[PDB]
Symmetry: D2
Subunit: 359 residues, 4 copies
């Protein structure tokens, strides 16, 4: 029996989460995507959105539409290689969602609207058992980063969890290696050079909570505060209060880069750090941390499924000769694609643990 999954919110992440599932052959074997929800039930429009993607190209699998019953006016069901997905109408309140009627057990919460634990807990009243919030959460939801602290998931305690942010998923693997291998981090500040996102504006618009963020996205460099570096504190508790950073939002539609500057806890060298990151990526961080030693630019990381892709040449070439403590590490991430894979990874991990906890 496949894991019965519902996706609440069918946008960049919702759809990329679905692409990941499909491409890795999980659909209908490991995971059953029972339903997807967005603004309407117009399956033809959902199919169009899945089929064509400015950044990630044409969806390579056929998407067709059909009716759940003849009593329905328009197609409300997606069909992907025989797999049927009901398109359900959005709700203001998660507890009204028919998860129980649908047999959905795991909900991927990707609207951006229910990041408060109490809000997301709505899904549990609707019949679901577990919720993965595809973003930082508030209200004490356990935060899990695949490859860093995901084994801290506890089936009997953790029902609404957060998969953190794409940025935290790039940074945390790096910091994890530094901490685990005994380099340590005394202090660190991160800058992410970040592609614009759905929240931004095409031309100067209205943004009362984020004045800079209201300015035209694809013509400016736009600074922002970010919780990503501080969030590593919750995932790697020893780093609590030692890390913060900021974002510069720049005119690319996808792919971002972390520029971490930090002080190590012991004498080391960039060469030693470089060697450790490469080893980690070949071993205990495989599939999470990758690396390159080629002359790559942002377009070259499109569709990379790793959380963090360490840039060896950028890092080795741009550090201080002979330096023992104060270093810069550069790492890339396809902010849509790697993160979406991590959501799927996390659901799979949770289901495995839930199964085990039964007996």
């Amino acid at each position: 029996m496949p894991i019965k999954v519902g996706i609440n919110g069918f946008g960049r992440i919702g759809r990329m989460v679905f692409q990941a599932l499909c491409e890795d052959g999980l659909l209908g074997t490991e995971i059953d995507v029972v339903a997807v929800v967005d603004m309407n039930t117009d399956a033809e429009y959902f199919a169009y959105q899945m089929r064509y993607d400015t950044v990630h190209g044409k969806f390579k699998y056929e998407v067709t539409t059909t009716k759940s019953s003849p009593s329905v006016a328009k197609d409300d069901t997606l069909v992907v290689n025989g797999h049927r997905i009901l398109c359900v109408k959005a709700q203001r309140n998660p507890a009204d969602l028919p998860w129980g009627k649908l047999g959905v057990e795991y909900v991927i919460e990707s609207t951006g609207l229910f990041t408060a634990k109490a809000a997301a807990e709505g899904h549990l009243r609707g019949g679901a058992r577990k919720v993965v919030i595809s973003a930082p959460a508030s209200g004490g939801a356990k935060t899990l980063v695949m490859g860093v602290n995901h084994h801290e998931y506890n089936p009997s305690e953790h029902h609404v969890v957060s998969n953190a942010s794409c940025t935290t998923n790039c940074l945390a693997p790096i910091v994890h290696v530094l901490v685990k291998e005994g380099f340590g981090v005394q202090t660190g500040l991160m800058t992410t050079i970040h592609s614009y996102t759905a929240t931004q504006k095409t031309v100067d618009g209205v943004s009362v909570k984020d004045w800079r963020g209201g300015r035209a996205a694809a013509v400016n460099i736009i600074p922002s505060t970010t919780g990503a570096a501080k969030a590593v504190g919750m995932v790697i508790p020893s780093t609590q209060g030692k890390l913060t950073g900021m974002s510069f939002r720049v005119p690319t539609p996808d792919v971002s880069v972390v520029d971490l500057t930090f002080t190590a806890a012991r004498d080391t060298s960039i060469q030693e750090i470089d060697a450790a990151l490469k080893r980690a990526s070949k071993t205990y961080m495989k599939g999470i941390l990758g690396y390159t030693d080629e002359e790559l630019v942002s377009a070259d990381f499109i569709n990379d499924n790793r959380s963090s892709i360490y840039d060896s040449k950028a890092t080795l070439q741009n550090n201080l000769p002979k330096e023992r403590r104060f270093f810069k590490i550069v790492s890339w991430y396809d902010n849509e694609w790697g993160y979406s894979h991590r959501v799927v990874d996390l659901v799979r991990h949770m289901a495995s643990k839930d199964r085990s906890a039964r007996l």
Copy 2:
């Protein structure tokens, strides 16, 4: 008397109408902007928005804020050249706006929410005498294009009017000159190569009424239907049914161009046409239709106050040799800025006529 103006909507459209008015030296002298009405009343934010523009640069005057009474916590009044503008909270119904109490006679309706004549007529109940919709209108509002048909304004009959669209304001002066000068138009098709706008999306997103328009704006050429060419029929009734057109939305934040292809009603030449357009711009179309014979690109038309800037070189170089009927005309427009000045021009024209009708 300085005419008493209120602006409903102080998003980008209302903002730029205000900035154009100020640029013309009109604030506190010819026009009393009494109030702006909007979701937010944070004058500080409004002042920030006026002060800095990604496209149009720095505002020529200083903007400060103050309080309407010592009681208010956050500044709720804008000040420019000594002139106070109250920031008023938006109302669900225009009927409920305090235009009567504020002594506002003319309302610039820029929200895009009240483009139906009967909806905009609510301002009249609110206390206003006249409404200019800064967009195409429905429900029978008289449409007026400065330099083309504005003299059709009838003070006793027209209380809710439309200034049409920026595109119609580019195209109509061209068609007007072709008809007035005896070339005639048998049939025409227009293409506008158009900067992206606020209605578009940074990344691929939901756009139920415009699928193409949901796609990432700054990395796509995005076709669209448009009403601009058909609308010319309403200001030049003899072209009714002879014109239509489309748009290609492209990754520039401002400035657009009309590419008009048409059949003349008599044998002529592109040289005759070129000469007529130039003659008209220097005379009866002065301030509305301009022209260039220089090697200009879109950036060169930023902050141009004219409705239409005929590209003599692009036109003369790209027509068929010896052709007598089938022609292309190229004309530019700062889609934000010319239109803003036209909204002001129209209010001023209506005001002069209203007063002439009374005294």
Copy 3:
């Protein structure tokens, strides 16, 4: 027996011809790419250029490098799928190139420096038998557009040919269908909304032969004259003097669109034209002309192998109701990719004809 091919010029144009050749699975079996010629001999850089593409993604074939003889300083040979490719140095005169010694029969002339029939004829003195200029040519070189007039190729007369331009390859199939299906073309004007190209400038630069062309490419709409519509008169001689046009260069890195406005030679309808275009694309224009009836934007045509992709929705929605003569047709092209495959198609066609004519 596979044909022996050399690529004069291995810039972006030459590169993509090669990738297209591999994509069709012709390397080794149908075509032998014996050598490339460039100012550069470095092969490692070539492999890097071949491996990563900002627009077209990652090359699906593994590229390694090696030496032709252990005597040479650095690698001078590319290895794709076990197939070896020599890198030779550029010559002042094409007569000096060693095609005869290399055993190369067919040369793809993609430098742009030997656009004249006489200059490109040097390749024949260098031991080659046929030349394909991957650009418009002068000096009376035969211009061949696949699916339009390629059967006009004559093995004993035509030894140096042109594959025209990417824009001509988009427009010509459209005009060809209009002519062959009996609609005809009395007059037409074409506008291409064109992605920026290598010849353009990142920031306002120097471009003495094209003043507008020197301006910042990714932030301007930039008009240009073009020869593409005129060149259709060479391919479809009945249209000589009936067609011209222009382009607007816009801020996208690849994919362009033709906007053709024309008067038919008989009374017809947009519905009749739409049906003919679709019928043609399924039959005698298969692989050259395609169509969509979906809500597509420029990204959706990336990596499309067709010369011309007719946009049925954009065409049907944006024509004049009940019109019998004056029509607009919209058609897309990946300006790099469709054309690259056509260069390869032409070579294959010339090969098989040369084979038959020798028999």
Copy 4:
């Protein structure tokens, strides 16, 4: 009375220096621009380039062109406010270029091809006295940064100087303040998020000396090594070997930002640093170092003539609370505008010291 100056390399940098030479209102009175030189001598083309700027808008002074002698085909003399400027033809070698015959002492070297001191010394043999390289130099030329070490100019020992790079001119004022205020700098790493430049490519192209730098500029984040931070160690000798950095080239046409992370030599706070930068900006650094406490984005710094504009909000919000040593400072620069004003500022400073000590 006026300084006899000749701009060599009337490209981007050459022109903007010239515009700064006029913007300050000193053409004719204090500085006499004798001659400019690019490759062509089309005054008409030069005037067009000067009139229209994609980034900086319309030039505020009217430009005309005339002939110097009736014997030559087209004009070769520019006229700005009555002041006449000749357009001499470039030489491949600076020594062949006739500066003495023209009577030019101060030459602004802005071709970018004569960055070697020995090669740039040719200007002297050609008949000129003083040279200012508008870029970093190699071979032992004296590097001067306005507001930092410009008073180290030695009128008898320094003939071919360097105004550094725009990035160095942003970073140096910051570090200078840190050093002079007693904060100290133990170690520093700098990242510049840099607008693309003329050396970059519209689409993937050939860049043998920088593989990443050949990739399409307006659609990629492109990392690069830089010398700007190391160059500061040369201009502020107490920091030699203690600073380095890198850049990320992003899709904006102008304006850049320095992200400096450093370790102070003793206990301080971000509040003390912030207060110090503000004070310095108002005092000893006035006109070189500016600051903002507003919510600005890159477009807002277009036309700012300061070398470095410290971002107070971005700095104060994105540091670690109660930290005493490890800090991030964010400072902006119009990489075109500020630097051009400094080139003018330097020549003028050199002018006085040359005629007070050596005269």
